[PDB]
Amino acid sequence: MIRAVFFDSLGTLISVEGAYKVRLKIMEEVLGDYPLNPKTLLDEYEKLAREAFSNYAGKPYRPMRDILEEVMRKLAEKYGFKYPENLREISLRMACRYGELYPEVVEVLKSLKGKYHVGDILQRDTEPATAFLDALGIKDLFDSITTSEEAGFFKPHPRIFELALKKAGVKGEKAVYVGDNPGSKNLGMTSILLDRKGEKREFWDKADFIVSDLREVIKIVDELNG
């Protein structure tokens, strides 16, 4: 049976409007009056971050705030503005201020929490990640929160999943993982791909289920439990 349902909250439960506005506000704060378009800085930042994280995929963990600060240092040198001090504070303030959940998130977590172990699996440093979840009002809706910093490795390393399962006290066969990107297979978890806009059809085959609204998750799991 299914006894645990895991999510990737800061990555699949944050509205894209909200995620973009947070990142734009960060860029705007960094630049101040410097004569560079913040949307151009943002696009270039997302480029270098994606690249830097892929270099680390599956590797031993290194603080993500440190990696992002190197990226911003490259951008400051590239465009000529002064490297912002305390960038991690700027980012955490802007996320707590403007971060936003998809509309059905709270209802879905509250409904699962009575009958299942509800967990979060996150690739974000633990301290800022947990402060963000508190600001969003969902930290205490989770039975467990597990990060790559706790596990010691970046995805797709299985270790983060092994630890999340240990916290829930079950083997992979008893759990589902809801993510928006397709490591996790050898452990036996049931994968649900969240594809709100039907934009990742080429990756549907590598997922056991595909949804566009999180309210479909309770149905899949209630179904799987006879």
Residue numbers in the entry: 1 to 182, 188 to 231
Original authors' sentences:
SNAr1.3 can operate at a rate of 0.15 s−1, perform more than 4,000 turnovers and can accept a broad range of electrophilic and nucleophilic coupling partners, including those that allow construction of challenging 1,1-diaryl quaternary stereocentres. Biochemical, structural and computational studies provide insights into the catalytic mechanism of SNAr1.3, including the emergence of a halide binding pocket shaped by key catalytic residues Arg124 and Asp125. In summary, we have established a biocatalytic solution to SNAr chemistry, one of the most important classes of transformations in the chemical industry.
Notably, iodide was found to be a more potent inhibitor of SNAr1.3, with an IC50 value of 1.20 ± 0.05 mM. The resulting structure reveals two internal iodide binding sites, with the most occupied site (about 85%) shaped by Met64, Arg65, Arg124, Asp125 and Pro128. Notably, Arg and Asp residues are a common feature of halide binding sites in natural proteins, despite the latter being negatively charged. Guided by the structural analysis, we performed site-directed mutagenesis of residues lining the halide binding site. R124A and D125N/A mutations led to substantial 180-fold and 68-fold/22-fold reductions in rate, respectively, with more modest 5.4-fold and 10-fold rate reductions observed with M64A and R65A. These assays further underscore the importance of the halide binding motif to efficient catalysis, although the large contribution made by Arg124 could also be ascribed to its role in nucleophile activation (vide infra).
